[PDB]
Design a protein around this ligand. Sequence first.
Ligand SMILES: *CCC(=O)Nc1ccc(OC)c(Nc2cc(-c3[nH]c(SCCOC)nc3-c3ccc(F)cc3)ccn2)c1
Length: 308
Amino acid sequence: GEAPNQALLRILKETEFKKIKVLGSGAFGTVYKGLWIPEGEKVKIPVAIKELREATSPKANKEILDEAYVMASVDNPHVCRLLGICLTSTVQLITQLMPFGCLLDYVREHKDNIGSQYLLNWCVQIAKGMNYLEDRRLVHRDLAARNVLVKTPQHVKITDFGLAKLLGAEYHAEKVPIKWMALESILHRIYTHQSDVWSYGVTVWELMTFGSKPYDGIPASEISSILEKGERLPQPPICTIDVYMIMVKCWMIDADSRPKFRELIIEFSKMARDPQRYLVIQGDMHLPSLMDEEDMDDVVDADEYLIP
Ligand SMILES: *CCC(=O)Nc1ccc(OC)c(Nc2cc(-c3[nH]c(SCCOC)nc3-c3ccc(F)cc3)ccn2)c1
């Protein structure tokens, strides 16, 4: 009872795109930004190119290709989809460029201009993307504010599927982000869609604290014990008990008594219907919308380039 994954893996010619700037390096390889012009199409698509540095003795290509498999199989307005790979001397991943960066840095550099409407709408959009990942039977295992990209201040998407794993029709693994993981994932290394709900709760806490580090100043090894002791993250200042109660339910030890992603969408959508009743922010403000550099006459954002 498992459906055949008929997703298309588009191979892209290196001629078809031009790098422009380095958005960050280290760790893996390098992440560039640039434009992708499919030959004979007359469109320029802003993309983000991620290649593996010095792939002369890596064998981490089994890791980058696993991410490409996952990114090519997802299609949701709140999930980053792979545009294609390039099989040059270094393997490259090409996805849609998210101009405003990850939501964790954006929430820090704009904390004096982020309204309750924006915060509650982001929590709905992240929950929608996660609910879609649950439909496709995919467990993210690495949900956080750093792994949610901001296309516009009004549109965020879930990304970074390196740790992502496709369940059948309760995954057991054995480097992890300790402070975002559900208790079962620490002790038993069990990952479920409800283990993502815990990480979703930590992600919401990141946004309401405008980017504070969870458990800041605590060693990672001591987290397994204080969570069994009944301790959680504090109530952020702007958080009413209404919002913080939802954050608390995500952090319950009984994993099945946690909220479903389809329910988190509904609760935060009801609060986005009246944002200042649930988030108290001093002075509820505006957020920005851009063409950058060269001849941007035929520019098409990737969400409008659909080749079947
Ligand atoms: C806060 C983490 C972050 O990425 N911030 C950031 C800053 C500036 C940007 O462009 C203006 C973007 N846009 C973007 C980044 C990525 C991406 N990032 C990473 S690791 C962190 C390095 O920061 C760039 N990997 C990717 C990536 C994943 C899959 C793929 F196929 C290509 C690239 C993707 C899209 N847009 C973000």
